Symmetry: C3
Amino acid sequence: SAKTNPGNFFEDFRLGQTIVHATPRTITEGDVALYTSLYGSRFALTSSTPFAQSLGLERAPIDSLLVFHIVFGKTVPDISLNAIANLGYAGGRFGAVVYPGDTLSTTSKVIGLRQNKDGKTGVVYVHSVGVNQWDEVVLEYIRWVMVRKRDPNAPAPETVVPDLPDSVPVTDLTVPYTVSAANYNLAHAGSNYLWDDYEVGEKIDHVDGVTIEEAEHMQATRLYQNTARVHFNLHVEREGRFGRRIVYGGHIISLARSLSFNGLANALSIAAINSGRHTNPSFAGDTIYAWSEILAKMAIPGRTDIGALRVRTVATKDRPCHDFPYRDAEGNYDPAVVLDFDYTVLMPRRG
Amino acid sequence: SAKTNPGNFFEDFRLGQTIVHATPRTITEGDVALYTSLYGSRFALTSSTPFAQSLGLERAPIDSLLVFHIVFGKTVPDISLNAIANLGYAGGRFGAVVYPGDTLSTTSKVIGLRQNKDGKTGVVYVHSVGVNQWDEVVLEYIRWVMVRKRDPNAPAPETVVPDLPDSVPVTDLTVPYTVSAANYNLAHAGSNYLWDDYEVGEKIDHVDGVTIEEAEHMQATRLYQNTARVHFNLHVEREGRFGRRIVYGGHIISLARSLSFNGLANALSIAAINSGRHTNPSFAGDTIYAWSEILAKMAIPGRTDIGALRVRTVATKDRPCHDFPYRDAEGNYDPAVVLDFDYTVLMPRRG
Amino acid sequence: SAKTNPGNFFEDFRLGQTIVHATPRTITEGDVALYTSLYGSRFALTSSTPFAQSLGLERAPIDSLLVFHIVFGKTVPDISLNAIANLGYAGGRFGAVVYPGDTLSTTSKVIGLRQNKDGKTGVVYVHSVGVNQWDEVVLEYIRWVMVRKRDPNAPAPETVVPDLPDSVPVTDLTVPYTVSAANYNLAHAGSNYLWDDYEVGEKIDHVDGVTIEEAEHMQATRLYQNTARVHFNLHVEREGRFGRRIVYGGHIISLARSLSFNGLANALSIAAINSGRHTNPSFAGDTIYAWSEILAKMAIPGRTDIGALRVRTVATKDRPCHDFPYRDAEGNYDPAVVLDFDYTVLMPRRG
C-alpha cells in the first residue's frame, strides 16, 4: 500500500468534511526578514518594533499577507494539489495579531461542491481557518478551486454552492492597535496622506515595476511550505502549454501590496480580503506593476483614530499603454491584467 | 609572503594531523527560515516549537542536515578547496541536539592517505568533529576526498587507509526526544504510517520534482560558508568541461530529504549518515526527483516508543522512464542518478 | 492631487534642508542570516556570538556594511530615486555598535548643490546620519549624487560645494571591542597574520571570483528596502543602453569585503569608509574578483591591542590578464574595474 499522499481529487471530497492539515508552523524573525527580502515591503508597522509599540502592539507584528500565505500553503497538499486553478476568495477576516514566535495550524471544511459540465473537473468550496498556539483564530477565509477528477466516470456529488459574502463587514474587522496624532510619526510612516484625504473613486498609479525571478517565487513558495507542482518542476512544466513554471498567485498579491506603498503608505495593515482573482498566469521574466482604486471609505464602529478603506489593487504585467487597465473587453479582463484584488485596509485618521 | 590561504594540496597533508577550522558559527532562527525557504522541508519536528516541545525538546531543533552542511562547510577551506571530488562518507553520528543560539566549531583529523596511481592526485580520509559551545559533539563523520597534487613530482606518502564502518550502529544512535501516542498528532505530522507499518525492502516513489536555480544553490552554499569555487565562478567554470557551475552535493541531499516527506513524513529526524555517493554532477536547470528503499528496520535498545529505519534515498535528474533507477549497468550507476544516500532515521512506533 | 512620491529632482533640493526618511528598521537575526547567505562573509566577529563576547561585546554585532546598506537604502526614495549615479562617499564614520533587535532611522541634510554645465542634471551633496532607538549615531557619511532635473529650464541654485574630508581621522574611530592574546583564537579567526605583519604598500590578490545572479542582487536590495528602479525593472531597463538591470553598487562593496577574507581575515570590522567609486556598472552574469592594497597603517590613540589599516579594495569583473588592474589609462580606470573602495579596518595587534 502506497506510502505517499496523492492529495484529493474532486470525487474524493465530501460535503461537510473537516480536514486537519499537516505541518504547523512557528513563525520567526527569520521568516520576517525573508518576506522583506522577497517583496521589499516598506510599511512601517512590520519594519519597526518601536513603531509598532507606539501603536500599542507588543512588537512588530507579522505581515498579514505572510500570515495568509502560510495558512494557505498548509491547505495546498489536501485541497489544491490536484487543482487546475483557484477561482476566488471571500470572507477573509484577519483575527488575532500574529507575532514572531507564534505557531499556526490550519483546518479546512468542505462547504460546497459542483462538478463541471464537461464532467472532467469540479469546483470545491472550502472554509479554511488558521489558529495560533492559544487556539485563537488569526485568519479565516473561503476559497474555491477547480480540481481534477481522477476518474472522469466517477458519479457527480449533489451540487451544493454556499452563499458567499461580498466583503467582510466593517463590524467584523479586528482593529488591534491604536493611533494618536501625538504619537504618530508621518515622516517615518512615509506619507502625509491620512484616511480623511483619500477620495472614494480615486485611482492611484503605483508607478514602480518589478521583474520576477525563478529563484524568487520558488523561495517564497517554499517559505510558505506550499507544494503545488506547477511552481517547481521545469521538467514537467516545460512540456505544458505555457512551457514554464507558474508563479504562485499569492506572490503577485504580495508584490502588489508592496508596490502599493507608493501611494498608500498609511494603509498600515490589511484587515480583510473581500475577493481575489488571478486573472492571467504570471511567469519569471514578467515585470509586475500595480494600480489601486478606493472603492469605499468606511468608519470603524466605536473608533475615530483609525478608519477603513476598501481598496481594489490591480496588478499588470509589462504595463500596456492605456492607464489603469481593467476590463475593456466587455467583462473580459485586459490580457495584461494578472490580479484583481479587493481588500480592506486600516488607516490612521486625522485628529 | 602571501597573505592568502591556498588551502591544502594532497602532498600537504600529514597522517594524524589535526586541523582546527576557522569561523565558528552561531546558528539562528534566520538560518532556520532560510533553510526552509531553500528546500521546503515539511518535517513537523523542525517547523513547530510546540510540536518539538510535546516530544520533550526545548524548542524546535535545527535540522540535522543544516547542522551537517554547516560542519561540512567549515572544513572546506582546509580539506576540499583543492579537491576533484568527495568520494564517500562513513560513521556520521549525530550527537547532542542543536538549537537556535548554539555555536558550532569544527576540527578535522587526517586518518588516511593514498596517492592515486597516475600520481596527479591523492585520496585523503578525514575524521571531522563538530562541537557546540559546551564542547558537546553534535556531529562526527568520516569523509574522503580526491585532492589535487600541486607538484606531480612530490613524493607519495605511505599509504594508510582506515577501516570504514558500514553504518553507525543502532547502539550509537542518540534518541533525544520521546513519543507517546497520547501526545503525538498524526494529522500534524502528516502521515498515519508509523515504524510498524513500513516493510523492509519496500520502495517509495516520492513523486515530486524540483528544479535547481543558480541563485538557489549559491545561496545555500553561502549559508554554509562553504567556499568551494566550482559552485560560484561562472567565469572559470564556463571554460571547464561541464561549462557551468556545479551544485554542492549536499544541496542534493537536502532536496532529497525534503522530497522524501512525501512517503516518509514520520521519519522525524536523521540520526546517522552511513554512506553517500554523489554519483553524477548536478547543475542549475536540472529537476531533482527522489525515491527511497527501506534497507532495514531496527529496534532501539531500551526504547519501544521510537524505532530506527535504515533508508536509501536515491536522487535522479529529470527522471527517466524505468522506475526506481539505480545501477542497471553492472555496478555502474544509471546516468540519471546523482545521489545514493544511505542513512538512518528515527520514527515513532505504535503504542 | 497625486498620492504617490515622485522623489526629489535636482531643482527640488534646498541647501540646508533636512529630510527625515521613512521606514525605520529593526534589524534582526533574520537579517543577519540573509546577509550571510547573500555574500558568504566568513569574518569571525559577525558569525559567532561567543567569539564576539570574548572581545567584550554583548553578542555578535551586525556587519558594518549591513548597517551601511540599510542606512543608505532609507535615503534612496528621497535622495537618489531620480539619480543618474552616485559620485562618491566621504567621512563615513561608524559610531555605536548595532546588535540584533536595534532599530535604525535615517535623516539627510543637503550640504551642497551644483547644477551641471549641460543644465540637464545637477550634483547634490548630502550628510546622512543613522541613529539607533537610543538616538545614538551608528553611522554618518557624506555622499554626492548626480540627479536629473525634471525641468531643464528651472533656474540653477547657487553653487555650494562642501569641503570633503580625505579620510575619517584615526582619532574619530570607534573601537568598541578589546583583544587580548590570552583570549584571541587565531585558528577560529582564520589567519595568523596580525596588524604587525602587514606591509604598507603590499598588494593582496583575494583569488576567488563569484558570479552575480539577478535574484541575488534584487534580494539584497529588497533587504535594504532600497527602491532604485534600475535594479528591479527589466521591462524598462531592457530598453535602456545596457539593456539589463544594474546591480546596486553597495552589493559590489559587500562582495569585495567578503572576498577580502582571503588575505585580510583578521580585519575584524570596518570602522570607516573614506571614499568609494563605482567606476563601471555591474550586471547579473558578471563574475566579481577583488584585490587590496595596504594604503597605510596607523596606531589607535590610547590602544596597543588593536590597530588600524587603511585599505583600498578594488573589485573587477571577469578579471583580465594583468594583475592588480587599476588605472593604466592615465587616470582612467581599466574597463574591468567596477569598484574602488577606500576604507579603514580594525585589526588585533601582537601582544
